[PDB]
Amino acid sequence: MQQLQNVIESAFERRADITPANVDTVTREAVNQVIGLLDSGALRVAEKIDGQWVTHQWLKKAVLLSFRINDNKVMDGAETRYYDKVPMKFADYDEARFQKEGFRVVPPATVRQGAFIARNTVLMPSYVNIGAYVDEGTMVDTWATVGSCAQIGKNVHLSGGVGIGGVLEPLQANPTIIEDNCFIGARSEVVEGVIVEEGSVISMGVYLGQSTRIYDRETGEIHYGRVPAGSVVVSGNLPSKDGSYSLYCAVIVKKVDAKTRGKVGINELLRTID
Amino acid sequence: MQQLQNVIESAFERRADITPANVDTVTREAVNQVIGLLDSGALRVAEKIDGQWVTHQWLKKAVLLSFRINDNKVMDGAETRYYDKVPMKFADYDEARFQKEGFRVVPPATVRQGAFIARNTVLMPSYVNIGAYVDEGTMVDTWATVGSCAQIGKNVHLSGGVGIGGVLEPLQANPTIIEDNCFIGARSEVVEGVIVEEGSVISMGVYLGQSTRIYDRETGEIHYGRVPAGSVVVSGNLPSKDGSYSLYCAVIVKKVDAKTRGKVGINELLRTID
Amino acid sequence: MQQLQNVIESAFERRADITPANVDTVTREAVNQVIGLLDSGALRVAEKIDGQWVTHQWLKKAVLLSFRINDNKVMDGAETRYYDKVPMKFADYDEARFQKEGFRVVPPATVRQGAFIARNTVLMPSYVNIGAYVDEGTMVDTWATVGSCAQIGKNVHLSGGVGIGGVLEPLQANPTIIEDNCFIGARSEVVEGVIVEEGSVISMGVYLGQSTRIYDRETGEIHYGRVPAGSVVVSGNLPSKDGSYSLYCAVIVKKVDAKTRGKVGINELLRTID
Numbered sequence: 001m002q003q004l005q006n007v008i009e010s011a012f013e014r015r016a017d018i019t020p021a022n023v024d025t026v027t028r029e030a031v032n033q034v035i036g037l038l039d040s041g042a043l044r045v046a047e048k049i050d051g052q053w054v055t056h057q058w059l060k061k062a063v064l065l066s067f068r069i070n071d072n073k074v075m076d077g078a079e080t081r082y083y084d085k086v087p088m089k090f091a092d093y094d095e096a097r098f099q100k101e102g103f104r105v106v107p108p109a110t111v112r113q114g115a116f117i118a119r120n121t122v123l124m125p126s127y128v129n130i131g132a133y134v135d136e137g138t139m140v141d142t143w144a145t146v147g148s149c150a151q152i153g154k155n156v157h158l159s160g161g162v163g164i165g166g167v168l169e170p171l172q173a174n175p176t177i178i179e180d181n182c183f184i185g186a187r188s189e190v191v192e193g194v195i196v197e198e199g200s201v202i203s204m205g206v207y208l209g210q211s212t213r214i215y216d217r218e219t220g221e222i223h224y225g226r227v228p229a230g231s232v233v234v235s236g237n238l239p240s241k242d243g244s245y246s247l248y249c250a251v252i253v254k255k256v257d258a259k260t261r262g263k264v265g266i267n268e269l270l271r272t273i274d
Numbered sequence: 275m276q277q278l279q280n281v282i283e284s285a286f287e288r289r290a291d292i293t294p295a296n297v298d299t300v301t302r303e304a305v306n307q308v309i310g311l312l313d314s315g316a317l318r319v320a321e322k323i324d325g326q327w328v329t330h331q332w333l334k335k336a337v338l339l340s341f342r343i344n345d346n347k348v349m350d351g352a353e354t355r356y357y358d359k360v361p362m363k364f365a366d367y368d369e370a371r372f373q374k375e376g377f378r379v380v381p382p383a384t385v386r387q388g389a390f391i392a393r394n395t396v397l398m399p400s401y402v403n404i405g406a407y408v409d410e411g412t413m414v415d416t417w418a419t420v421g422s423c424a425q426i427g428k429n430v431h432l433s434g435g436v437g438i439g440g441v442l443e444p445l446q447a448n449p450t451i452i453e454d455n456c457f458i459g460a461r462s463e464v465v466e467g468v469i470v471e472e473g474s475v476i477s478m479g480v481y482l483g484q485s486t487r488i489y490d491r492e493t494g495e496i497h498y499g500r501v502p503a504g505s506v507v508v509s510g511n512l513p514s515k516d517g518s519y520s521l522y523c524a525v526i527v528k529k530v531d532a533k534t535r536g537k538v539g540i541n542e543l544l545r546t547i548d
Numbered sequence: 549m550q551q552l553q554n555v556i557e558s559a560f561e562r563r564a565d566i567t568p569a570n571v572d573t574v575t576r577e578a579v580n581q582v583i584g585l586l587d588s589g590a591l592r593v594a595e596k597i598d599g600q601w602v603t604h605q606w607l608k609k610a611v612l613l614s615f616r617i618n619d620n621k622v623m624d625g626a627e628t629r630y631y632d633k634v635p636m637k638f639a640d641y642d643e644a645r646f647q648k649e650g651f652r653v654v655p656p657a658t659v660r661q662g663a664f665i666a667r668n669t670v671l672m673p674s675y676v677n678i679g680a681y682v683d684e685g686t687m688v689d690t691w692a693t694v695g696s697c698a699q700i701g702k703n704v705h706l707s708g709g710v711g712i713g714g715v716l717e718p719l720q721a722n723p724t725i726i727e728d729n730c731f732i733g734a735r736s737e738v739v740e741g742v743i744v745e746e747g748s749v750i751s752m753g754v755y756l757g758q759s760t761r762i763y764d765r766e767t768g769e770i771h772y773g774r775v776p777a778g779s780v781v782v783s784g785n786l787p788s789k790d791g792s793y794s795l796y797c798a799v800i801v802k803k804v805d806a807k808t809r810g811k812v813g814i815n816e817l818l819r820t821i822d
């Protein structure tokens with residue numbers, strides 16, 4: 001949408017000098033419009049086109065600017081109080097709306113406005129930050145986090161305490177992406193724009209960033225930045241040249257098979273009852 | 275209780291076709307009765323008999339069915355709202371009740387109805403899921419999670435960010451069990467029905483599942499599925515056959531001694547003041 | 549303050565026999581006074597003097613005694629209820645106060661009374677326990693925890709799911725300290741009085757306690773208890789004598805450089821807008 005993109009790209013250049021007081025109504029209204037569209041899933045920060053994920057840098061820009069244009073407001077918790085500038089997505093939902101949108105939200109799961117949550121998902125107590133997109137069938141297990149602008153595929157299981165990297169701080173070029181049908185094991189973390197290709201199974205306590213060596217013991221091939229579709233990855237180490245010590249790495253031990261599927265399947269009984 | 279077990283086992287077979295609308299009052303009432311009993315500690319999903327933990331599969335079945343028989347309801351948070359089908363355990367407690375039950379609940383710790391919490395425990399902000407049982411004296415530290423149906427012994431310390439596996443998704447045969455007097459170090463995870471025997475000390479960042487090799491450096495013995503009573507376990511790796519790389523494992527480095535006890539003791543000053 | 553320190557040190561000796569009922573008004577009032585001072589930053593549990601961090605053991609004592617002198621009270625959550633004896637820091641703040649104190653508090657972040665939060669910090673949903681001190685510019689990312697009495701420097705970034713050890717349980721001699729300008733990578737844990745010196749970068753999934761070997765591959769020097777200023781630390785292992793297995797350790801791989809700074813910088817656009 002040019003009328004919106006234009007204003008966004010002009011404002012971004014003046015980011016440092018914009019404040020909630022000096023911002024003109026045009027930039028304010030535009031940024032706000034863009035956040036509502038992300039919130040509804042009409043727009044998304046990254047999308048797959050021709051077998052490639054592309055990032056719309058200007059939607060990322062809008063997310064950033066929202067922090068320069070909005071002022072903080074006291075939010076009343078019950079026993080306590082908060083002071084922040086991004087509204088809560090569900091603050092205004094009624095049963096009819098929850099009923100139509102079709103996902104389950106377990107207290108105290110919290111989602112910021114500007115994040116899209118699809119039908120048939122289950123959010124256990126967890127956090128979904130602004131700009132993120134969580135597709136159909138996915139479960140975000142306890143204390144997991146979906147970082148700003150992150151893209152999560154359909155039928156994905158993000159285990160307890162798992163973290164998917166954001167793009168706000170530290171600042172990142174690209175969002176982190178988890179394709180369809182992946183299983184991410186407990187306490188693992190995927191950051192810095194790494195792409196976990198569809199049907200992959202990441203074991204527990206695996207840490208993937210751009211500097212992480214993803215070693216394929218079968219081919220000897222070492223990857224960086226992505227997990228090839230259908231891999232089973234676990235933690236390991238690679239020895240130094242003198243064998244004096246070893247350093248952490250992720251190892252692709254095999255391709256997903258029946259034995260693997262037996263341990264990571266989604267439970268449909270917990271999904272939306274049509 | 276046969277009158278209840280019977281109905282449960284009949285219904286479970288039709289699990290996929292049961293919905294909150296078509297379920298008959300008999301199955302509804304039964305499942306509900308069983309959840310109240312788990313909630314009060316009168317029944318428990320697994321129990322130790324003759325030096326063996328046994329799982330009552332039908333109590334697990336009842337837990338599962340509760341998700342087929344109950345409908346979602348809007349739950350009013352303060353700044354936000356939730357939409358789920360399992361009530362909050364403490365929603366109706368008054369001071370007299372908390373005073374009688376004798377445990378401490380630190381905001382925003384949350385527990386689902388159907389989980390048993392014993393006297394003299396302390397829940398820092400954490401999550402205890404349906405069907406779980408948390409025995410006397412235990413502390414569940416910050417952002418720890420006690421998964422569905424998990425069994426936690428007396429005087430156990432579950433450190434910050436620790437996860438004890440559930441049985442709902444992925445679906446599991448048996449609950450995860452932590453016997454009396456264990457210490458589980460920060461950020462560790464214990465899943466898939468592994469049993470951590472009494473008096474064991476699990477260090478930080480240790481990940482135990484059924485596939486994890488638990489290597490005893492002293493005997494060369496490799497365990498699977500359980501941590502022998504009184505072990506001190508830490509993270510390590512075992513080399514591949516070509517020494518080309520190494521893969522994660524848990525190592526039993528020694529048996530708990532005075533030096534160990536010095537670092538993992540429970541603080542009675544924080545327990546219930548009789 | 550002698551008038552306060554005296555009462556504190558006398559009472560501490562009788563800790564086990566003090567209860568909320570038998571405690572005399574003098575000890576009660578004193579302990580309470582000391583907690584208010586910690587809350588405001590007028591006093592702090594540890595402080596750096598002459599290039600050395602010193603711990604005021606008696607302020608730690610006061611923190612402990614607060615648990616012997618105060619009784620539990622029901623705290624009304626919205627959907628649920630809690631029962632604890634430490635008030636919520638922000639329960640009484642209004643917009644004017646939040647506006648003057650100058651930090652951002654993202655729901656559902658929670659802080660206990662007795663912890664100091666400085667200007668220009670951002671608390672994503674996280675936990676800050678009693679006695680802690682969080683200095684200017686710092687961000688406490690999602691599900692991170694600042695343990696009791698811990699000291700966090702200025703401009704520090706505590707990543708998602710990071711844990712900084714407390715001193716209450718297990719009981720510790722000294723608080724854990726993170727000096728200015730450090731970056732602590734996701735899911736890492738720093739405990740047992742370890743000191744991370746200024747400008748250091750701790751990677752993801754690094755676990756540091758007093759028993760952790762911090763190996764400097766360049767010098768062959770092995771540290772214990774502290775991370776030398778300006779280090780980049782990552783997870784690794786050191787081989788056993790027979791090469792039969794290896795055990796976890798932290799490795800200092802290099803000194804912070806431009807390439808490192810490129811990945812761990814603070815985003816000023818998210819800080820307080822003056």
Ligand SMILES: CC(C)(COP(=O)(O)OP(=O)(O)OC[C@H]1O[C@@H](n2cnc3c(N)ncnc32)[C@H](O)[C@@H]1OP(=O)(O)O)[C@@H](O)C(=O)NCCC(=O)NCCS
Nearest residue numbers: 159160185186203204234253259260263439465483485522
């Ligand atoms: C990866 C996983 C799914 C097992 O898959 P699997 O297909 O059964 O893997 P296998 O048991 O066949 O092992 C295949 C190889 O990988 C290794 N391996 C598998 N999982 C491993 C793990 N977690 N740690 C170390 N090694 C592991 C085996 O040692 C084996 O190596 P080898 O061929 O050299 O001997 C399992 O380890 C896992 O990650 N489970 C997830 C638990 C979880 O997070 N639950 C959520 C709770 S909220």
Ligand SMILES: CC(C)(COP(=O)(O)OP(=O)(O)OC[C@H]1O[C@@H](n2cnc3c(N)ncnc32)[C@H](O)[C@@H]1OP(=O)(O)O)[C@@H](O)C(=O)NCCC(=O)NCCS
Nearest residue numbers: 433434459460477478508527533534537713739757759796
């Ligand atoms: C295990 C632990 C308790 C130390 O116990 P300990 O009995 O003092 O162990 P020691 O220091 O004697 O070490 C014994 C052996 O295990 C090793 N070791 C112990 N803890 C280790 C750890 N965390 N990482 C790596 N190695 C460890 C030592 O290297 C030593 O190996 P060696 O005999 O080959 O040289 C400690 O490491 C730990 O896990 N503390 C828990 C911290 C925590 O989670 N706190 C909660 C904050 S919420």
Ligand SMILES: CC(C)(COP(=O)(O)OP(=O)(O)OC[C@H]1O[C@@H](n2cnc3c(N)ncnc32)[C@H](O)[C@@H]1OP(=O)(O)O)[C@@H](O)C(=O)NCCC(=O)NCCS
Nearest residue numbers: 165191209211248707708733734751752782801807808811
């Ligand atoms: C440490 C880090 C910042 C990279 O710093 P860097 O200066 O770019 O490090 P480099 O890529 O130059 O690597 C230097 C050495 O350390 C290694 N290394 C760096 N980070 C590593 C990691 N996470 N795991 C394993 N090895 C790592 C490299 O293998 C290399 O070893 P070599 O010299 O023997 O080949 C990055 O790994 C990291 O920790 N990012 C933090 C992500 C995070 O938690 N984000 C927050 C999300 S909430």
Ligand SMILES: N[C@@H](CCCC(=O)C(=O)O)C(=O)O
Nearest residue numbers: 147148166167168169670818
């Ligand atoms: N590492 C997180 C930081 C989020 C910070 C944030 O959302 C805020 O300041 O409100 C992210 O990049 O998503």
Ligand SMILES: N[C@@H](CCCC(=O)C(=O)O)C(=O)O
Nearest residue numbers: 122270421422440441442443
């Ligand atoms: N891994 C968790 C998943 C819990 C899901 C749940 O409780 C729900 O759908 O409400 C568990 O098996 O306990």
Ligand SMILES: N[C@@H](CCCC(=O)C(=O)O)C(=O)O
Nearest residue numbers: 396544695696714715716717
């Ligand atoms: N490991 C934590 C334990 C905190 C316990 C606590 O604060 C309480 O009992 O209220 C700490 O030592 O800070």
